[PDB]
Amino acid sequence: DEAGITGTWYNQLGSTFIVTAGADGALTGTYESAVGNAESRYVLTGRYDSAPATDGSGTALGWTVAWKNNYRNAHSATTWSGQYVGGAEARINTQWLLTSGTTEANAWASTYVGHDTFTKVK
Amino acid sequence: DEAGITGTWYNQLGSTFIVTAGADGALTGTYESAVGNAESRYVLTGRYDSAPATDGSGTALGWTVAWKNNYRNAHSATTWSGQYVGGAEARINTQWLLTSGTTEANAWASTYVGHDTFTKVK
Amino acid sequence: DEAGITGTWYNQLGSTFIVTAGADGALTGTYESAVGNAESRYVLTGRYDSAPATDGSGTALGWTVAWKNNYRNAHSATTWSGQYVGGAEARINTQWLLTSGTTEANAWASTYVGHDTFTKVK
Amino acid sequence: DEAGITGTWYNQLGSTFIVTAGADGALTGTYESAVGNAESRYVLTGRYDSAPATDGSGTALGWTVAWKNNYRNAHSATTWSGQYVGGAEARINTQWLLTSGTTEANAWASTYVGHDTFTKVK
């Protein structure tokens, strides 16, 4: 599913995920968040299963954005872990962890958890 | 903290995380899990905050491993999201999400969550 | 929102959440999972914010089910943490953690994470 | 493990978890957080597996605190999901989800995730 994953994806917040899937399992591209302490595009990288099961299962994948670019630095990183599901209404269904750099006293509150669903439309 | 992060790290399970931190925010290297459906080294990639706060806060980072190599394919991916804390007993404190490729009927059970602490010793 | 929360709720899997909200912040009732190692109803208990903000924010709440009843014992417990949002299309938006009893060797894989959205219809 | 679980527990932050395990699977008691927007004791309730496996596995359990008492209201709830491990150095190993009541615009950032380990000492 190199073909299936590569391209522009959109989540329920209106964020834009632009990815290229490599034959080797690499994910590279850019992320633009519609929310939070974010402006414009941020580098992403990640990995995907380049030889998924042929029993109708999804394709496992994940990627990271560190929220620093030329405009802003939110001193934080998000990882998305999920699976690509192909077909007429292709989706990437994810859960994510957003960690901030914190002092040791605040480290208990360093990490948000959430879920994003990406589609090829909207 | 390019210097601080780059090198060999070990978690509480005895897994080995070998990383290079790029001046640009890139993380590249290899991961070897002491547990699960895993053998030998797997590619990782990720990102880190290359200009962290100077108020004693940690450095945010994350990375992904897709559990396919020349030996095995576990049809799964783990993302670690966390922060690097420098000093005499440097640590990377993480939480992680492990997603399997699943059928739609099993997708509710696709994702494990856990936490790993990495040190430069053991 | 004692009135708003009390009643029968349904999630996207077709599970049924039957709850009573107490004036004191208590949640009591029963849960029936449409999936997994589950049959019929299981006891639940939990808590909710009985004096929520009046600025349009949701109402925080959570509850637990241990997956033992007279029929089955899945040696596991799920906690849902979320917020109630009132109005024409009332919802309870949750994330959940499902922990199994494990041996120490398997404890890294003890916990699933997911998300459920409950509505008053279907 | 009604006997094993019932009593006073302490986590790595110095919080105090006071619980009674019922023969029926109920957990009742009080929680006092050493951190966050919290003062004094808060009601908790939860559930545990009252007939765990006899193969050396832990005992699954969970509980909820809504962060309202006579002193403060943090408009939030935490759920802990985990397992009790008996013996000389008994532990309750948990992961937790802390949800705030939010506006719909902030709901993506409503939930923290973390992990607490409880012991009978300190």
Swiss-Prot record, chains A, B, C, D:
Describe the location of the Avidin-like domain by residue ranges: 2-122
Annotated keywords = Biotin, Secreted, Signal
Keyword Metal-binding recorded? no
GO cellular component terms, alphabetically, are:
extracellular region
> Which residues make up the binding site for biotin?
31, 42, 80, 96, 108
Residue ranges of the motif Cell attachment site: 47-49
Q: Which domain of life is it from?
A: Bacteria
Q: Which compartment or compartments is the protein found in?
A: Secreted
Keyword Secreted among UniProt keywords: yes
Q: Which GO terms describe its molecular function?
A: biotin binding
Major location category of this protein: secreted
Q: Which family does it belong to?
A: Belongs to the avidin/streptavidin family.
Q: What does this protein do?
A: The biological function of streptavidin is not known. Forms a strong non-covalent specific complex with biotin (one molecule of biotin per subunit of streptavidin).
Q: Subunit structure of this entry? A: Homotetramer.
This protein is called: Streptavidin
Lineage runs: Bacteria, Bacillati, Actinomycetota, Actinomycetes, Kitasatosporales
Q: Which residues of the full protein are shown?
A: 38 to 158 of 183
